[PDB]
Design a protein around this nucleic acid. Structure first.
Lengths: 249, 735, 95, 513
RNA sequence: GGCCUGCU
RNA sequence: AGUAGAAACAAGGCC
């Protein structure tokens, strides 16, 4: 109901009507990236400079109807002045902390299921067992190794269709996945995330990260396993070796 | 006793303590005003290194151009751009012979990419010179403006959605009698053929800031949008070629560079017997970009693309053809001050052609006098050579050809050489039975380099025995030695957001521990200092302290409200649980089991009004410009929390005549959000097609209302309401 | 965790002694005819030594100290330091 | 079909070698081209003066770097480093804990002996009476705060003509259009020439010497980290504790904290109170040997209008700092300072009691957003230094299969050359090397400039060449005079870079033997 | 005097 | 004046 209604409201005004009519689907990306905002050259300097202002961050308009304009002593939490090239309003950082102490609460039980990679890292490290540190010269030789320890033996494009069919089943188009490994992955990640309401985009991004294999060139000495490379900073050094066995093994 | 750190080198070798010689703890030099002086100096220097060439006047642009190719051979060691066509063609032929099938294959993959590439690939670029407004703007904005102007003028082949078609339209625009542009102060202005040619062939010049390692400032250039597609295709070909060359090091990272350097030094020295001596030259090329003539790149590519479809050759040749006629905008201008009357003034650079020379000092006066003959419509012709490393990969190809030309099969002498080339820098390992052989080999290498328009900087170069050398701030001494002073500037808060900054800092510490041999105790100290600076920057202190800030009240009440205070994030005033073992874990997941369910739910709430995600590309990618290197992007692990807000924008557009761009931004974003709600996959996979917005949106409204009734909330009343509302918007689009 | 005790020796009855252990910490003692006896830990002290003896620590020096005062012949034991790991113990002989 | 035609074809006909007429002909020639020994012919024909002859590099080859000559070098720091004085209260508050103005007033009330201020050493270019009146105004308004109910967290000062001149207000020339100002003869470019030449002075050497000396306080209170769980983490923590014990009692750490706090406060005030002049007391909190926490008040900073748009835009402030060092002994070091006499101090000494004078160094200084940001990240000097020391320790421990930190820091048997005395080269323990490197990094962050970067690069090149010579690797150069000229052009007027050049000359003299 | 902006 | 260094800041524009 609503969606077509703001569609009609947009088409009511002449300029947006022209934009909707003359613009083709292919140009979607271009106009979406059409912005006057330059990409910052020195982000640290301005982040240290903007945070000294009042209302340094930006938030959706809806914040004006969930968080009061001021806190107990009267420190303002949000302003009604919109951003430069968006309908979002500039708000103070307190509106963040406020949201974490009296804002609406939900059931975050499914975030562990979504962010599978990070929670698997945590579980692997929690059950790890350290050993003695041995001091001897390490011959670090540079090798190509896979960093992602949960890659399902799929490439970027190869798993992209799987991700769409898992999250966006209707926009798949011609592709119907042939490999049965992809079939089982689709089934599992479909039944697992059937009602998760985090965001389609973040779900797709994390599925891409988990399933897609990624490789990088690093100086290693021993190890060479996927689980042993994520902790390469902790097990191998310039003149010391720290024996380690992740919780998985 | 007087303390002197440098004397420490009397016991510790120079490379083992080279980090002490990198003052990367202070503010790097910045330029303050116009870069016009540097632009003029660079143009004059590029034109006078090729003075002995031949002059001509282009019949289309009417600008004077200098061709030094096949000019007189140099008779001195000064820089020279007199490259010889036959010599470079022979070098490329030998490169092909030593690597058969390189050019044909690379051309095949490049042909595939060119004929399947899309227009949107041009949006994935940093600032570009929009000619519609004569100023630098984001790549997407400039592309959109140029497409709009083309469509208004009648060039609508780009509607096919293909980059090749966009380039076809671009070339067709060159043969138009009169184009029309828009200006706000809206006014429609008409550009004749020559003016549009110069506007499409021109470059915008700026001054490079945050450049560490030299006393003087330099100038850099940014091209337009008409020529970036050809550049993209040419660089794709050059990258595909260099990926097949082990002597190149430009298309790889740092660790790969070190590995290849070690391999080449071991190969050269190990194969050398006791009788052969080995010497390493740590060479830098003086005026690398100013001495590389685009015509020679045209020759190299047309030799590479031999026995290929003529359309491929034409599309790959268009780029150097435009660079050979490239023009450069002088710059921002010049600012004058009058102390007697106590005032200041800012004259644009376009007045340099006619403005009197009484206001300029002797140096600038002479520079303007020398560059005036080349001024055409406020921009100077820069045919002789490249401006700033636009063809990095082709230059690397030429250098690799030079390196391979001494494989002992072409030297025809006992001496021989090899090494690694990365544009403007090289390491050359030369072996010969005696010092005379080494001298002859280096002399012939230098002479051959001078025949290709490449000069070796004698002041910044030195030769020693193999085993010790330098390459791009990587010091090799019987094995590469860590520096850690190049990455020091990256140890602070990045400046993206709270969660992003935390993750980026911990990940940078981890990486520099893995690669740059950062010590454990040093890493712990870095973690402590980073946490201190992070808390002091975001006003998020431990919470149990009495440090009054603008955010210390809400943080303190959250602290007193929470029961398990060990689960609070550092952003919310909680303890830091990070350590050397936890540097690869996001903060949210490390504290997940310690958080109270109420605070956990409030933090990671999808309905939060702070989190905003635009595209799959910008989810967890942060662009950090590294010190002493080109802009780079990093993947940082982070969980989407309420702290993932995006900061405020500039907001200074409101005082400029270009104020309508914000309204267009808002309307485009509203339409894009509506489309995304209609097409959820709009962000992850960019939609493709040739239909218009409202058609897809209305038709999908039809179908989705239908099916969501066939099972879902909709009802006949609502379904029919949607159907007739779709009809209403249909008849509205009719009129 | 390696531990070294210092500060033991021969002392007079009613005298004072400062044990130190270079490394949670405990001090325990063993007399020649017996097993381990709890002394102090860090604070808590056993009945036989309370008010006479004080346990303290410097977390910047990585040291735990046992300040013994008004010593009795019944304090004669090897005093061992321990970390939650054992030291080798330092002999204290009161007479 | 990608056809070149029309204007774009003619451009292709004008982008060929000199003796070609059309792209068709050039492509035909390229396709018909085959290698027939053309590089050899031109190599033979090319003049033999085009060579890369190698000049041997011997012990007698390198000459000392020449230093510029001129008036002595002046002080450039944003605060006093060697001549600072501290007024204290012995409070239990932590670094960030507390309110600035009340702490400053309480510290200043701890001192008795105030006298009516008078000029001792003039600025020599400004109006010293303005500085005097500004000091008295600061005192008066400090009392005004003391009287009222609760000390404000941040105070704004009145915009009197005194600080209007001292802060450079309404002095930027008004921006106009060129078409309205063309007949003005004085109208010309901004002064763009090489900076004034200045010769090195001996004060920077002593300042660095005393910047590496120990102190009676701990100037670093580090944050918390996750409890160590792995043995390697325990080793790292022990190493870190050793270095903290070595460097905390160091003037370099005190300078780090001073700069960080001052720049943070200045940046925050500039971003918040853009229009109105603001008072900020220089505060630094330390911990005594006895363990009692203490606050220290060096002086005050008055920040002016700070409407900073570009990263290079300058915010001007005026800094006042107490001291006991008489400026009548090294006047050339205080060219830009105005120094008054404000009181007398009595420090307990065996010679009765000194009753020394107590002066106020007052000056007008300026910074920028980039400078403030980089000065508020001075804590990475600790990193740089201690990473270097830990690299030394690890490299040595790779030889003997055992961690070597404890014996390095306690036995102090091994020593490194860390300075030269008239008797000869002096070596110090690893802790002294730590402090020396920390001081070097701190001074790099304080006296940063393009000269420093250029000299560092062009002298690292020569250092590598000299190291190759000392390693018996038959080093050679193509143009050493060019490298020397490249190094010598970076030495203009910066005290730090000139001191580095003098150090490099001394290292060359001691090396090459 | 009143209001707008701080990488456009 | 001061910062800074091959050109700039020492507020800008709009009424």
């Amino acid at each position: 109901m609503e969606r077509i209604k703001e569609l009609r409201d947009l088409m009511s005004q002449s300029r947006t009507r022209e934009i909707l009519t003359k613009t083709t689907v292919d140009h979607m990306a271009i106009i979406k990236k059409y912005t006057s905002g330059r990409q910052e050259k020195n982000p640290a300097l301005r982040m240290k400079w903007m945070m000294a202002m009042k209302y340094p961050i930006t938030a959706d308009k809806r914040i004006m109807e969930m968080i009061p304009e001021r806190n107990e002593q009267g420190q303002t939490l949000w302003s009604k002045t919109n951003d430069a090239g968006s309908d979002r309003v500039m708000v103070s950082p307190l509106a963040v902390t406020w949201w974490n102490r009296n804002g609406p609460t939900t059931s975050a039980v499914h975030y562990p299921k979504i962010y599978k990679t990070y929670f698997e890292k945590v579980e692997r490290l929690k059950h790890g067992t350290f050993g003695p540190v041995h001091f001897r010269n390490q011959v670090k030789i540079r090798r190509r190794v896979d960093i992602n320890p949960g890659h399902a033996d799929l490439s970027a494009k190869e798993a992209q269709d799987v991700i769409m069919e898992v999250v966006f089943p209707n926009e798949v188009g011609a592709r119907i996945l042939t490999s049965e490994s992809q079939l089982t992955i689709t089934k599992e990640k479909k039944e697992e995330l059937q009602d998760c309401k985090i965001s389609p985009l973040m779900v797709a991004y994390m599925l891409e990260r988990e399933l897609v294999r990624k490789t990088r060139f690093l100086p290693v000495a021993g190890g060479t396993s996927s689980v042993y490379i994520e902790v390469l900073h902790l097990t191998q050094g310039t003149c010391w070796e720290q024996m380690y066995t992740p919780g998985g093994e | 006793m007087d303390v002197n750190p440098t004397l420490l080198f009397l016991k510790v070798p120079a490379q083992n303590a080279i980090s002490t010689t990198f003052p990367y703890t202070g503010d790097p030099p910045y330029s303050h005003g116009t870069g016009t002086g540097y632009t003029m100096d660079t143009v004059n220097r590029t034109h006078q290194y090729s003075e002995k060439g031949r002059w001509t006047t282009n019949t289309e642009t009417g600008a004077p151009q200098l061709n030094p190719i096949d000019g007189p051979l140099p008779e001195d060691n000064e820089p020279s751009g007199y490259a010889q066509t036959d010599c470079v063609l022979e070098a490329m032929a030998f490169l092909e012979e030593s690597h058969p099938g390189i050019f044909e294959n690379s051309c095949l993959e490049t042909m595939e990419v060119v004929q399947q590439t899309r227009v949107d690939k041009l949006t994935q670029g940093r600032q570009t010179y929009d000619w519609t407004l004569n100023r630098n703007q984001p790549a997407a904005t400039a592309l959109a403006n140029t497409i709009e102007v083309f469509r208004s003028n009648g060039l609508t082949a780009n509607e096919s959605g293909r980059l090749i078609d966009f380039l076809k339209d671009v070339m067709e625009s060159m043969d138009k009698e009169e184009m029309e542009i828009t200006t706000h102060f809206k006014k429609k202005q008409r550009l004749n053929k020559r003016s549009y040619l110069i506007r499409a062939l021109t470059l915008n010049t700026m001054t490079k800031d945050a450049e560490r390692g030299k006393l003087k400032r330099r100038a850099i250039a940014t091209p337009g949008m008409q020529i970036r597609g050809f550049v993209y295709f040419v660089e794709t070909l050059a990258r595909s070629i260099c990926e097949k060359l082990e002597q190149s090091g430009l298309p790889v990272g740092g660790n790969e560079k070190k590995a290849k350097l070690a391999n080449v030094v071991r190969k050269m020295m190990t194969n050398s017997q006791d009788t052969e001596l080995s010497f390493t030259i740590t060479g830098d090329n003086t005026k690398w970009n100013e001495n590389q003539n685009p015509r020679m790149f045209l020759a190299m590519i047309t030799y590479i693309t031999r026995n290929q479809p003529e359309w491929f050759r034409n599309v790959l040749s268009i780029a150097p053809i435009m660079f050979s006629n490239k023009m450069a905008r002088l710059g921002k201008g010049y600012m004058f001050e009058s102390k007697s009357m106590k005032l200041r003034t800012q004259i644009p650079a376009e007045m340099l052609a006619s403005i009197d020379l009484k206001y300029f000092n002797d140096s600038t006066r002479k520079k303007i006098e020398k560059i005036r003959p080349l001024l055409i419509d406020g921009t100077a012709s820069l045919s002789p050579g490249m401006m700033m490393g636009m063809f990095n990969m082709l230059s690397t190809v030429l250098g690799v050809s030079i390196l391979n030309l001494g494989q002992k099969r072409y030297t025809k002498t006992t001496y021989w050489w090899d090494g690694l080339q990365s544009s403007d820098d090289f390491a050359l390992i030369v072996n010969a039975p005696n010092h005379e052989g080494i001298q002859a080999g280096v002399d012939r290498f230098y002479r051959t380099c001078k025949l290709l328009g490449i000069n070796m900087s004698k002041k910044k170069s030195y030769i020693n025995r193999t085993g010790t050398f330098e390459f791009t701030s990587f010091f090799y001494r019987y094995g590469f030695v860590a520096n850690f002073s190049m990455e020091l500037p990256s140890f602070g808060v990045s400046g993206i957001n709270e969660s992003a900054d935390m993750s980026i800092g911990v990940t940078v510490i981890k990486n520099n521990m893995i690669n740059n041999d950062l010590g454990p105790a040093t890493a712990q100290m870095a973690l402590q200092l980073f946490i201190k600076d992070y808390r002091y920057t975001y006003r998020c202190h431990r919470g149990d302290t009495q440090i009054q800030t603008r955010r210390s009240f809400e943080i303190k009440k959250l602290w007193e409200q929470t029961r398990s205070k060990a689960g609070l994030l550092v952003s919310d005033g909680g303890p830091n649980l990070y350590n050397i073992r936890n540097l690869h874990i996001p903060e949210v997941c490390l504290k997940w089991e310690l958080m109270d369910e109420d605070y956990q739910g409030r933090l990671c709430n999808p309905l939060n009004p702070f989190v905003s995600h635009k595209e799959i590309e910008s989810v967890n990618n942060a662009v950090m410009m590294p010190a002493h290197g080109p802009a780079k992007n990093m993947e940082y692990d982070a969980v989407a929390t309420t702290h993932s807000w995006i900061p405020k924008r500039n907001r200074s557009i409101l005082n400029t005549s270009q104020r309508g761009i914000l309204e267009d931004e808002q309307m485009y974003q509203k339409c894009c959000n509506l489309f995304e709600k209609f097409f959820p996959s709009s962000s992850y996979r960019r939609p493709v097609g040739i239909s218009s917005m409202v058609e897809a949106m209305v038709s999908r409204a039809r179908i989705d209302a239908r099916i969501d009734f066939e099972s879902g909330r909709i009802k006949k009343e609502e379904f029919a309401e949607i159907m007739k509302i779709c009809s209403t918007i249909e008849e509205l689009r009719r009129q | 965790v390696q531990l070294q005790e210092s500060g033991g020796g021969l002392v007079q009855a009613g005298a004072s002694l400062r044990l130190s252990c270079a490394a949670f910490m405990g001090w325990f003692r063993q007399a020649p005819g017996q097993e381990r006896e709890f002394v102090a830990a860090i604070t808590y002290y056993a009945d036989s030594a309370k008010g006479r003896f004080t346990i303290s620590r410097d977390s910047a020096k990585n040291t735990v100290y046992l300040q013994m005062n008004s010593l009795k012949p019944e304090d004669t034991a090897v005093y061992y330091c321990a970390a939650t790991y054992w030291g080798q113990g330092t002999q204290v002989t009161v007479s | 079909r990608f056809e070149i035609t029309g204007t774009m074809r003619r451009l292709a006909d004008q982008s060929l070698p000199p003796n070609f007429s059309s792209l068709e002909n050039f492509r035909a020639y390229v396709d018909g081209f085959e290698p027939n020994g053309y590089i050899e012919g031109k190599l033979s024909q090319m003049s033999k003066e085009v060579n890369a002859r190698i000049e041997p590099f011997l012990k007698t080859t390198p000459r000392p770097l020449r230093l510029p000559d001129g008036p002595p070098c002046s002080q450039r720091s944003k605060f006093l480093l060697m001549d600072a004085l501290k007024l204290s209260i012995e409070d239990p508050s932590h670094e960030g804990e507390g309110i600035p103005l009340y702490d400053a007033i309480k510290c200043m009330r701890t001192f008795f002996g105030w006298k009516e201020p008078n000029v001792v050493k003039p600025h020599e270019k400004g109006i010293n009476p303005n500085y005097l009146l500004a000091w008295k105004q600061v005192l008066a308004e400090l009392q005004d705060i003391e009287n009222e109910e609760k000390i404000p967290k941040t105070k704004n000062m009145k915009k009197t003509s005194q600080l209007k001149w001292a802060l450079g207000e309404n002095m930027a020339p008004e921006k106009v259009d060129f078409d309205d100002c063309k007949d003005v003869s004085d109208l010309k470019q901004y002064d763009s020439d090489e900076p004034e030449l200045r010769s090195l002075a001996s004060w920077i050497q002593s300042e660095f010497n005393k910047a590496c000396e120990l102190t009676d306080s701990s100037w670093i209170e580090l944050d918390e980290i996750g409890e160590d769980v792995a043995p390697i983490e325990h080793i790292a923590s022990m190493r870190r504790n050793y270095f903290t014990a070595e460097v905390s009692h160091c003037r370099a750490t005190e300078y780090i904290m001073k700069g960080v706090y001052i720049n943070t406060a200045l940046l925050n005030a500039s971003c918040a109170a853009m229009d109105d002049f603001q008072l900020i007391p220089m505060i630094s909190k330390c911990r005594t040997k006895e363990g009692r926490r203490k606050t220290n008040l060096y002086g005050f900073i008055i920040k002016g209008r700070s409407h900073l748009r570009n990263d290079t835009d300058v915010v001007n402030f005026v800094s006042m700092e107490f001291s006991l060092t008489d400026p009548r002994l090294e006047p050339h070091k205080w060219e830009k300072y105005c120094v008054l006499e404000i009181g007398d101090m009595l420090l307990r000494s065996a010679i009765g009691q000194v009753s020394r004078p107590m002066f106020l160094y007052v000056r007008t200084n300026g910074t920028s957003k980039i400078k403030m940001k980089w000065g508020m990240e001075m804590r990475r000097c600790l990193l740089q230094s201690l990473q270097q020391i830990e690299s030394m320790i690890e490299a040595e421990s790779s030889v003997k299969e055992k961690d070597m930190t404890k014996e390095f820091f306690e036995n102090k048997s091994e020593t490194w050359p860390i300075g030269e005395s008239p008797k000869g080269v002096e070596e110090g323990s690893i802790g002294k090397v730590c402090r020396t490197l920390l001081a070097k990094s701190v001074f790099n962050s304080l006296y940063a400039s393009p000269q420093l970067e250029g000299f560092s690069a062009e002298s690292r090149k020569l250092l590598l060449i000299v190291q190759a010579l000392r390693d018996n690797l038959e080093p050679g150069t193509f143009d050493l005079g060019g490298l020397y000229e490249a190094i010598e052009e970076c030495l203009i007027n910066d005290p730090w870079v000139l001191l580095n050049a003098s150090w490099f000359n001394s290292f060359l003299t001691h090396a090459l033997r």
